[PDB]
Design a protein around this nucleic acid. Structure first.
Lengths: 245, 431
RNA sequence: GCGUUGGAUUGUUCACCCACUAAUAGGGAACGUGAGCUGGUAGACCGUCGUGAGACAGGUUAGUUUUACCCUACUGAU
RNA sequence: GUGGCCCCUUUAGUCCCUCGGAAUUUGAGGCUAGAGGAAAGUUACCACAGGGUGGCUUGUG
RNA sequence: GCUUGUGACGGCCCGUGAAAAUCCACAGGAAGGAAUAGUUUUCAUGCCAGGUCGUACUGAUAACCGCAGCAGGUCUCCAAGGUGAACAGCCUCUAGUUGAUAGAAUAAUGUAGAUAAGGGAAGUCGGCAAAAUAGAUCCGUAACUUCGGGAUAAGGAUUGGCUCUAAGGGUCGGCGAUCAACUUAGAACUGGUACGGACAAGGGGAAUCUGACUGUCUAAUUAAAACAUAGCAUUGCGAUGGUCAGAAAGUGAUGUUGACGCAAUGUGAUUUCUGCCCAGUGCUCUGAAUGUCAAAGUGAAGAAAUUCAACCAAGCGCGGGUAAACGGCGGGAGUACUCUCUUAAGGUAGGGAUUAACGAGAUUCCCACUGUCCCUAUCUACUAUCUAGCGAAACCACAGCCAAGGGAACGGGCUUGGCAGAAUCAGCGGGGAAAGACCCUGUUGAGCUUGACUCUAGUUUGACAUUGUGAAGAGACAUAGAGGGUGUAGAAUAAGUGGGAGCUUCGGCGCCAGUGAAAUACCACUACCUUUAUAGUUUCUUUACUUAUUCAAUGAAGCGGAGCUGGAAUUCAUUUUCCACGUUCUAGCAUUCAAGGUCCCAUUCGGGGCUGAUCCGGGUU
RNA sequence: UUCAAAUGAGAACUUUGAAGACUGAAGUGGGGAAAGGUUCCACGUCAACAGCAGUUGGACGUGGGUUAGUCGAUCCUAAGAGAUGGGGAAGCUCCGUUUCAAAGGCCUGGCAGGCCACCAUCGAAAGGGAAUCCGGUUAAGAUUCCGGAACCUGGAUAUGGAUUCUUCACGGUAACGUAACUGAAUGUGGAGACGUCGGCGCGAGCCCUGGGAGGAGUUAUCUUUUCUUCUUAAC
RNA sequence: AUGGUGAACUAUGCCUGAAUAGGGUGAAGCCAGAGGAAACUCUGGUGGAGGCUCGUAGCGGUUCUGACGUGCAAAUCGAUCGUCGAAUUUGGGUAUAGGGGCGAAAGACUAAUCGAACCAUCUAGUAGCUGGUUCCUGCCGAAGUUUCCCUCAGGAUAGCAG
RNA sequence: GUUUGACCUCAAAUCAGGUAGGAGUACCCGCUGAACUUAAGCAUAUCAAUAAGCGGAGGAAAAGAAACCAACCGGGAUUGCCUUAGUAACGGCGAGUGAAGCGGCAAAAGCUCAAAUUUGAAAUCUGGUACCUUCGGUGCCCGAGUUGUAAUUUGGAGAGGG
């Protein structure tokens, strides 16, 4: 048989991301003495757009303490920040939107974004548009902190891990229909080559497990296993269930 | 996914089984719903009547409770608090209503109790008191005659679940405290003379076959069943002692008195005429196979057979094959002579057919293989007449009798039949 | 010896229908394997079957052979 | 009158042979005598190599 | 007015539409600089030099690629006048070319066009093809409709030329003077067979099936109801990760990513509909014990090789879930059969179905129109034809008149007959030329599929090694013990079997007496069941440490502990915890071993140290 | 397509002239990129080729011809390619492009004390980019040569000018202005540097057109007539 | 099978650039007027949206009993047709390489080669079946179930002749 | 003495002087490693411990003076030839594969380290430098080296003491 599309996706010839017009990798400030003990102030200069991304970014300028110079970080903007705003980042920072704090300092019930799975990760969770995590409780002994993620899962992580207050901007982006193939074309033009998607049923047997037949059908049971391997995993990888909910 | 997670239980339980210190509020959010649901369930095509249902569509409340019961039964071990009364709620949901619950919910609770007993949350001593009372209630004849009562299916489910329970309990070592307790309920069911010992016999046979209840205490139960008045209980006992018999005969307390009581109660005593022929024959088989094996003496058997020993009678080849099985070396051969002379008068007489004569001779020679001095030389010769009979049934039959008496009493045979070694043995031993 | 038509009908025509007409006769030279010009493999869909690849009791649709200038015959011409 | 009418499994060897440097004891192999008895479909998307009147009839059951 | 450049604006995006070299300015103020004279080369002038390689020509119906001086293909700039909406079509200016084998005739058949009386689809599988319509102004425009369209719907009145009228503007003057363009409406007269006069330029309508649409593909026979699409639904995954690569790697894609995301599938706009089954096959479950149960490891026998037994992970088996998973289509009860009754895929209403637009998609009918046809005729151009010059190819056993016979149903050759006169030109397509599919077979070649056979990457679970330092518990081997038995009756809870009528502390008692299949004292046998202890033997679970190992980050910057210091803080007498001397109205600034204080030297135009800024540490975090 | 003449042994095809037509500014024109490579131009010149012909030719033989500080490459980086260090691999070689390196360049005053922080290279003759225009000239070359007139870079530098005894300029309320009017480390900002469509405005060139000064053409009749020249570069 | 060469055609992605007359319809926003107590409505204008439309260049390749058929051409010519401001057309640079790539999916394309490219070697590869196998004369001279290996089957044998 | 030095380890230099790469590759030393074919089709098998691929040398390479063959009255490094032998043996015990000792011959060749106290004298060696009779010698000076350079000893033996 042939090698199939998902197997070809791993080499990364024509499936690499399209990264020319991206403003830069969005990240939090590196964990330093200031963020660990007190706070530090920066100025948000520009609220800007990032190609291939629905959420906007913010350019935040901070003052290097060890040398006389300026350092520009690229944050993911939360809903409500504005140019000329002061962003306070650290342990002793106040509880306002856009500020960066550790999860142990804040109380439970608060809303944060761009959370680090571990301290020094510089942003892992709640980065897409309209997304947020909710702190539900702390455990100061054994220092840990329990959070709820956008998928609904509940996790426990270090209280020294950081996050930025508020909701990521750009919400509602998926409530608008596209109505046209051209808008999907231009959307994925800047993300990657995962569009259009031909159906495996419409191919020959060399090209897919689902291919073949005088009628467009699958010969079996679209729930594949998890111990399957590299050419068998067509659809519904490890389905605990199927059907409408 | 977050808003749908409360609706998706299969993902919730896999998440809870990982980190159950989290997902406390997610569990309370469902336990409250389960409580509010059980608090509810606690309490035709004609032109006139309301339309009926197909039997497979259900309510959205029941479809939710059936899911919540499984979720709570699978995470009770993670949340021992807030679930301590859950199995008692299930138990008093079952054995106080029995009827305001749909069959799917009943089945779900019955399986959740079984897995809650597989895990050591619940004990067998309190699961038995849930399972047994439902059998008698769904074998009621008044509960099983609704519109869509699933009484037969429930009676099968509870039965196989009891079997799984006892198989579970008797794996490592035999839980005598449990077996001795649930044999007492079989005894106390067989007392109730209507039909309720069915669920004792049908269960003890299964456990004997699975080898879980090899004990002297159990064979007494089936003895009492065989000595019962109900036909489908007596038959269960008889077919147990049959299954050629099984090792249970070697755990009886008095086989002779057992056979005597059987022959007196069922067949001869009152002549109630309850059993049909197909059951009378199975009783005869048991009696004769006990008798021949254990050297018993009743002497009424051998006149009871004579009514039925006629070729114009229904399925006589089974009766006469049990006639021989009640013969010995140690019984008065006159009461068997009358039997042999009935058979000879009615099966190898004038004009009879080939199959009839062959059946007669074949069932006489296998009598004489146990009771050799039960027919005399004068009729022995009359029957070895039929050696060269041209029919190939009677010849094969007569040769068997000749070879039987060639090794046992060859002087009854004539010189023509003593085959080269019986005659030589007689010639040396006659001088 | 001389004539033996014009048309309708493809949810079909191994044929029938109404008209005109003097008449609207039957056949062969191909169909005793296969031979002018014209209607009646590759792609795709529905149905039956098949675990499936695919096949068919089917049905629908679209879908590139291209002489003669040679001999003979025939027709006319030296 | 010396009867009748038509090939891969297993066991055993007095003092059987050998295990090749000699021996003993186990095993193994022999020669004897016994007892038993690897593998399914499809291809019209295809390719290759080969092959392919008895004068017969007519209108009458 | 055309082309082009530019400016300020507006609209569109789940699209917000390169980087670096190079140049400048600003902040800052190290520093150096005038006095009897300096400073400034970002003001003006003046002086010197600027290397290597390319540079012609075509850029195409003859300079490139197609075997070629091949009607094919191949990126781009400039672009006049008139008609006219127009870079359309027609004619012309500048510039360029006048190249493509020629001459004579005008037969058929052809190729490319054109016209035709009356009838108008009688033709034909089929109105194929052709014809007809066509531009602009005005009137008018149905059903249906996703209310946006359908729609140029349909169907009708007109169009020339010439002479006129009216209206539509700008600049200056305290209504006039002056200047200028093509836009429309209207009237009169006039020629006509024709007036969008050539060119140019929709045929329309009533319905059906089908896919929503725009779009895409079988280059070189299939452009479609196929693919894609938006929309719809399902699944996996919270980074120690999901999906996918790589021989390996201190290796990679998604990922400059983080559930409004990535990956994997199916369905295929909107509207309407969307009922039930987890028996089967798949998928899944942090699913007990028992069963099956590999290697290592353990025990027994033996002199040993070896043999046996026990233990034995996952997986299987077992039982729970799931159908917008493949399947599939009823349920229950009473005695597979047989009787019974519920069938909730019920139309919610008798307004339940009268249902767009788009399409080189498949189909029928009507109007109009015609040489499709009756029924053919005529004309034009290039060929054919003849001539000068030039000059191939296919095919070719040998050849070339017919009939009958034999014959593989079938002769140009053989037999018997009919006949038969040179050499030849133009035509024709009957035959010969003379060069197909279909059917079958190989124990074939390849492609594809599957619980066909043998294997395998990958993945998964177990053992060993890497692998070191501690502790606490549970189970088992193995011995030593200790006790036990309710179906019923019987004084009583009778493993069972065999001997029988006292050793006697008591003569309690055992025998003789019921009842029971079996009879109890007393003493032996050998079955099961349950518990007590650990010489030892082992196995297993949990937990601690860090230096191996592993992961990530950084500028390897602030780590760990301190009567630290100073505050409070609440104590039950002395602590324990918080803080720390550092920063939160504001789109500013923060840099020269850091100023100051203090000790010493030198008096210089200034140097060095402590402190400002707590101490220690063989761990960058 | 035609007529005459010339050339020549020979002319339907060559040259000139006289006619008739064509492309008709989205050309049969004038220039370029890729590719080709002398095919360009001249002088001789016909054996073979230009499916007829040939005195002709992109043919044959012999020569000539391509001039740059300003046009380009060169330089920069784009997607991307790829060494080193290190790690794999039996190995040809693979990974990866700042990595887990002691990866080097500035100051002050038997070398002593300080400061800075960072990755080879390649990759566009349509992207970015310092600076030239006119006229004339050749058989064939030109934004390259000749003449004339400018500009950019880099370097050494003298004079004048500006400033200064209030040492490193004045004016203007201000927006800001001028011939200039010191400025190291370090830092910051800007330019380079950017989509597409719609219409509106402004400019250049072209189109159309009038008076006048010149030349050509028509004139059988008419036309104060039809056509044509009257231009102004970088800086 | 082993080892190597190809993205100058073509498929797809990325980078940097370029090209695309004249008309028809007339969406949001906006202006005025009329009717309103006001929600708001009606009329006339402005404006210039659309993966709209007619239709050039351009891209494609529907139909013709079309021309040609050793053709100009190993896919061309003519007329007719689809589309024509965008999922558009395109140059150069770059990336993906053979049981591999790419694929809006036809088993399509991958240098006239694709249901597995091209080059060389192993290689004089090999079954099965076909075709052919070179001078004269003399003498002798046949054969077709007779018996069998899992039925065809390639065979092994009886008999015949030298 | 918070100074001054010695050693160890790791670096840098366009430091002084040398050295490796690549070609050829008939033969040679290794590594890696197929299929066609032949077996009935075919997994064992055969083709084959072959071809292709990689690394590395020389005029020859490799091997080589026994941890050998043997079972004899014992031979006596290695290599090659004749023979052993199409044998012993291996193998769906099928296709097929397949050595060795002995004997005759060609050529002939033996040896070296570590492990031992020089301990009454590191006696050893590279380099730099000045001369010389220059494929090298003498002197002198830095250095290597006792974590061991020379002599002496290599199992056949051998050493020390006499």
């Amino acid at each position: 048989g042939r090698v199939i599309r998902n197997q070809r996706k791993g080499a990364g010839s024509i499936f690499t991301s399209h990264t020319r017009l991206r403003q830069g990798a969005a990240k939090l400030r590196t964990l330093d003495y200031a963020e660990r003990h007190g706070y530090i102030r920066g100025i948000v200069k520009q609220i800007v757009h990032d190609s291939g991304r629905g959420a906007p970014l913010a350019k935040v300028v901070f003052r290097d303490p060890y040398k006389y110079r300026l350092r520009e970080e690229i944050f993911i903007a939360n809903e409500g920040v504005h140019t000329g705003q002061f962003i306070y980042a650290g342990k002793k920072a106040s509880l306002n939107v856009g500020n960066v704090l550790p999860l142990g300092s804040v109380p439970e019930g608060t809303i944060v974004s761009n959370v680090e799975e571990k301290p020094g990760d510089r942003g892992a969770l709640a980065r897409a548009s309209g997304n947020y995590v909710i702190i539900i409780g702390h455990n100061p002994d054994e220092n840990k902190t329990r959070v709820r993620l956008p998928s609904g899962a509940k996790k426990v992580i270090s209280s020294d891990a950081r996050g930025v207050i508020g909701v990521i901007a750009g919400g509602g982006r998926v409530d608008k229909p596209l109505l046209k193939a051209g808008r999907a074309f231009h959307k994925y033009r800047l993300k990657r080559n995962s569009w259009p998607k031909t159906r495996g049923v419409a191919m020959n047997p060399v090209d897919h497990p689902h291919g073949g037949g005088n009628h467009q059908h699958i010969g079996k049971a679209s729930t594949i296993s998890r111990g399957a391997v590299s050419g068998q995993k067509a659809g519904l990888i490890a389905a605990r269930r199927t059907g409408l909910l | 996914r977050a808003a749908m997670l409360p609706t998706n239980i299969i993902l919730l339980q896999n998440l809870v089984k990982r980190d159950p210190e989290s997902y406390q509020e997610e569990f309370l959010q469902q336990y409250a719903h389960y409580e509010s649901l059980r608090d509810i369930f606690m309490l035709g095509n004609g032109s006139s009547t309301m339309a009926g249902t197909n039997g497979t569509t259900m309510s959205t409340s029941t479809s939710q409770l059936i899911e919540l019961v499984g979720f709570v039964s699978q995470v009770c071990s993670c949340f021992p608090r807030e679930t301590a009364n859950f199995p008692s709620e299930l138990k008093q949901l079952l054995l106080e209503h029995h009827k305001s619950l749909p069959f799917e919910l009943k089945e779900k609770i019955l399986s959740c109790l079984t897995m809650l007993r597989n895990k050591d949350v619940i004990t067998a001593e309190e699961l038995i008191q849930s399972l047994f009372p439902l059998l008698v209630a769904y074998s009621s004849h008044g509960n099983s005659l609704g519109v869509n009562s699933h009484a037969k299916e429930l009676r099968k489910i509870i039965y196989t679940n009891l079997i799984s329970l006892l198989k579970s309990c008797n794996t490592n070592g035999k839980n005598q405290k449990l077996n001795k307790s649930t044999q007492a309920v079989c005894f106390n069911l067989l007392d109730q003379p209507d039909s309720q010992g069915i669920w004792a016999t049908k269960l003890t046979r299964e456990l004997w076959r699975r080898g879980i209840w090899d004990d002297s205490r159990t064979v007494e139960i089936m003895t009492q069943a065989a000595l019962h008045q109900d036909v489908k209980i007596v038959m269960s006992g008889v077919m147990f002692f049959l299954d050629l018999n099984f090792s249970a005969i070697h755990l009886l307390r008095d086989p002779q008195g057992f056979a005597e009581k059987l022959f007196k109660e069922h067949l001869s005593g009152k002549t109630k005429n309850k059993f049909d022929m197909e059951q009378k024959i199975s009783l005869m088989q048991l009696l004769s196979r006990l008798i021949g094996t254990h050297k018993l003496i009743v002497l009424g058997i051998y006149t009871f057979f004579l009514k039925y020993l006629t070729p114009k009678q229904r399925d006589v080849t089974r009766i006469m094959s049990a006639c021989a099985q009640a013969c010995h070396d140690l019984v008065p051969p006159e009461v068997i002579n009358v039997m042999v002379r009935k058979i000879a008068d009615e099966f190898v007489s004038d004009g009879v057919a080939n199959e009839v004569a062959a059946a007669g001779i074949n069932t006489i020679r296998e009598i004489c293989s146990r009771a050799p001095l039960a027919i005399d030389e004068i009729l022995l010769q009359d029957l070895v007449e039929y050696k060269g009979s041209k029919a190939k049934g009677v010849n094969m039959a007569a040769k068997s009798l000749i070879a039987l008496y060639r090794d046992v009493a060859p002087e009854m045979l004539k010189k023509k039949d003593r085959g080269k070694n019986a005659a030589m043995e007689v010639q040396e031993a006659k001088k």
